[PDB]
Structures are given as structure tokens and as C-alpha cells.
Amino acid sequence: MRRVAVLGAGPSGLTAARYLKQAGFEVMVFERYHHVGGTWNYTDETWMSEDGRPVYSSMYQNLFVNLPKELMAFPDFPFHDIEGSYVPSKEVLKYFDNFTDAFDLRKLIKLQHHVENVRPCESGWLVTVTDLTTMVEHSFEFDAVVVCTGQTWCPLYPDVEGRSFFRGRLTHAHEFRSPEPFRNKRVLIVGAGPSGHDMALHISYVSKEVFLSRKFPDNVTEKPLLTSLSEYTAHFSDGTSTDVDEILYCTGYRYRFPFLSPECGVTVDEKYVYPLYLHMLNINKPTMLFIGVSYNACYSIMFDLQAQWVTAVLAGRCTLPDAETMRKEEAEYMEKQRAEAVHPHVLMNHQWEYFKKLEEMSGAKTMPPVYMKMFDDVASDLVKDLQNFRKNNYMIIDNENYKKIY
């Protein structure tokens, strides 16, 4: 391998570019937006941009992180000085802009370039991209392709009996930018994950009555599963019903890679991408790898170790089994996800053991154990104390210990 394409310049693509560059590859990064940083960029556009391509960002106004900045920084690139552990979103954008300049990656990135197609070409890959400033299509040959285009832009909707009859306004979390369209409305939020809880909190400030349906301020009434809709009325599994003007679906996202031609060898289902080894390596075409298909983890460690493992594979330095053994282990792993009732690429129940395995394979520096200890202490605080957890401040003391500040 010498020439490697990275698709996307969010946190996955930037961290890939860092380590691929480190490794002496010739790297090119394609990014459709006009700034690096991925979903940490806020735009008022939703769905499709005036520039003729999709909007990939689901960031909204006045968002604060849900994990302390101490766990969001890479172990060897600390956060810039800012007061507070639970920073606004624009500080994490700044952190990735600073990362990009600290590791001299900006000269690698083609901004406002939208990847339209990726297909195998003999032993290599052919990537077709449009320069959105000129609308000209350009073509590029690579020995390897690392896909880092994210999974929080293509919405997933529940199927709800009677939805076609509802005559209020329907929206999804992707398009939420501020609570203003919900002012004085009766709002049903479906899905009580991070988006549902946070959006419920932001909407509770402007709206008449907010309902949160899951299978808070006075404002927010909890509901069980939504089981049908009629013209202006939502019906719950508990037999109760409430009239609503707006439904906001916070039911998450599906995987979607429109540029992958079928010849790339990957099947993309709503919550499953296969066949990948360790959520990264395309077993059918092993010079294509993905970063960021797994989720629900300590993301800074996940990006850093995935990018080093992908780099080690491409550099010929990783301890890999044969394709048959990778298919077998992928199967075993996905049987276990079904037994634990989690989706295929959810790392939460075994992330530390997974990260240890990526370190052993790739020769990455061992993670400071304080990341594990702090994450395990604080990560579910959004669930446990939604209204006040962001008031807490932390400081890392050394690679084993942290403290809570006041």
C-alpha cells in the first residue's frame, strides 16, 4: 500500500489521517463540508444543502457534551484550556480544528469534495468525487480506502400502526436545530435515548406540554410505547391517548453508504454492516476498512485505536487470522450481541476488552487505565442526573487516578 483514501474529516477521518500520515502513506482525505470536524459543525441547513448534496450534520444549538472533556481528548493530545469539563459543542469543534493543525493534516484534506462512488479496480480502488465549488467530477486511484463518513445522518423511523393517518407535523432528530418550531405546541417525542432526553429538556422550555414515549421538568410527561396514531391523537400501550400537534422521532439512525458500489463486497442493513472483522475490516475486500461503524463506547479511545489498527493492517504490521477464521469470529461475536440484546455494532458491554485486543494487534501504546475508571464512573450520569450532571468538573491526576473538582 502506498496511496490511501480517507472518506470524511470528522473525528474518525482526522484520526485515521494522523496515523496513516505517521506511517508514511500518501493520504488524501475527502470531506464534503467546508470545515473539518464532522458532526461537531453546526449548520442551519437540514436534509439537503443548497450546494446540491446531503447535510450530514445533526448538531443542534446550545448543545453541551455528555462526557467530560477529559474523556473526549485523546490520551496524547489534551484539551486546550477552557473552564469546565462539560464544554459547549464549539469547544470540541475547536479541539478537532487544533488537532488537524497540530499534526499537519490540513494539507491532506480536500474540503467541499463529495464522494459519489467507490468501486474496486483490479487490485486497487477507484473513487469518484465532485468538487462542489466547481461541480466538476474528478476521479482518483487508491490502493486502500478507509471509510469514515459517520452514522448519525440517515434517520431510522419506527413503524407505528396508523402513522399514515397522522395530520400533525412529523420530524426526526436529524433536523432538530432549536426548539423554536415547537413553541406553544403539544409535542410527542418518541425514543428516550440521549436525543430524546436532551431535546425533551430543550423543548420543555418553549412548549405547552411535552410527552416522552419510551419502550425532567414539570413540563415532561413520560409515556410507555406508542402503539398507534390517528389524525391528531397518539395512542399508547397502556390504553391512554393524548392529542398532539407535533411528533419528533428520536429513534436514532441507520447505516447508509450511498457511494459503495455492490462490487465493494459490503452489505449495509439498517443496524448491521457486514462482513467486517472487529467492526473495521471488509473481509471480502480487505484493503477497505471502516472506522466509526461501532458506537456506544468511550469514543476518543475507540477512534484512536481503530485508526492505529487500520494503519497497522495497511502497513503489514497487524496480527491477523485468515479470512475463514475472521468469518467464524464475526459470527460468534454477532451471536453474542443478539444474546445480550444489543445491536450488532454496540461496544458498551465489552469495550475495554475489545480495546485491549486492538492494542495487542496493532502495537498501539496502552490506554491510561484512568480513562476506564473515569468513564465507568461518569458515563451514565446523563441518565442518572440529566438536569445537573454537567455541573460536575474533573481533573486527571496521573494515568491511574482522577478527582472531582469544585
> Of 29-37, 131-139, 245-253, 255-263, which part binds ligand NAP (CB under 6 A)?
245-253
Q: Is 41 annotated as a binding residue?
A: no
Rule CB under 8 A: choose which of 2, 34, 167, 328 binds a copy of itself: 167
Buried b (16+ CB within 10 A) or exposed e, 218-254: ebbeebeebbbbeeeebbbeeeeebebbbbbbbbbbb
Q: Could you say whether residue 267 binds a copy of itself (CB under 8 A)?
A: no
Measured from the CB atom, the residue of 243 and 360 that comes closer to a copy of itself is 243
Could you tell me where the DSSP H helices lie in 253-380?
Answer: 299-314, 323-340, 351-362, 369-378
Residues 216-255 that bind a copy of itself (CB under 8 A): 230-232, 243, 245
Q: 110 burial class (0-12, 13-18, 19+ CB within 10 angstroms)?
A: middle
Using CB under 8 A as the binding rule, whether residue 209 contacts a copy of itself is answered as: no
Distance CA 197, CA 66 (A): 12
Q: Which residues contact 344 (CB under 8 A, 6 or more apart)?
A: 271, 272, 273, 274, 334, 337
C-alpha cell at position 229: 396514531
Q: Is 56 annotated as a binding residue?
A: yes
**Cβ count within 10 A of residue 215:** 12
| Gyration radius (Cα) of the chain, Å | 22
Taking contact as CB under 6 A, which single stretch among the options 101-109, 186-194, 203-211, 256-264 is the one that binds ligand NAP?
186-194
Closest residue to ligand NAP, Cβ-based? 193
Contacts of a copy of itself in 118-157 (CB under 8 A): 154, 157
Q: How far is CA 272 from CA 34, 137, 347, 376, 392, in A?
A: 30, 31, 13, 26, 36
> x/- site string to ligand FAD, residues 55 to 74, per CB under 6 A?
-x-xx---x-xxx----x--
Alpha carbon 207 to its chain's center: 29
* Cis preceding-peptide flag for 275 (omega within 30 of 0): yes
β-strands 220-223, 209-213 pairing: parallel
Tell me the per-residue interface mask from 33 to 72 with ligand NAP, x by CB under 6 A, - otherwise: ------------------------------x-xx------
Binder among 68, 252, 275, 344 for ligand NAP (CB under 6 A): 252
> Which residues 6+ apart lie within 8 Å of 33 measured at CB?
9, 41, 43, 56, 57, 111, 112
* Residue ranges in 200-229 that form contacts with ligand NAP under rule CB under 6 A: 213-215, 225
Judge whether 242 is annotated as a binding position: no
Going residue by residue from 5 to 44, which x/- string records binding to ligand FAD, judged by CB under 6 A? --xxxxxxx----------------xxxx----xx-----
Nearer residue to ligand FAD within complex by CB, 239 or 262: 262
Query: Pairing relation of β-strands 26-31 and 154-155?
Result: unpaired
Cell of 58: 445533526
For residue 225, the partner it binds in a copy of itself, ligand FAD, ligand NAP, none, with Cβ less than 5 to 8 A by kind, is: ligand NAP
Q: Binding site for NADP(+): which residues? A: 64, 66, 195, 215, 390
Binding site for a copy of itself (CB under 8 A): 47-48, 52-55, 154, 157, 164-165, 167-169, 230-232, 243, 245, 256, 258
Binding site for ligand NAP (CB under 6 A): 63, 65-66, 152, 158, 173, 190-196, 198, 213-215, 225, 250-252
Q: Binding site: which residues? A: 12, 31, 39, 56, 64, 66, 115, 195, 215, 390
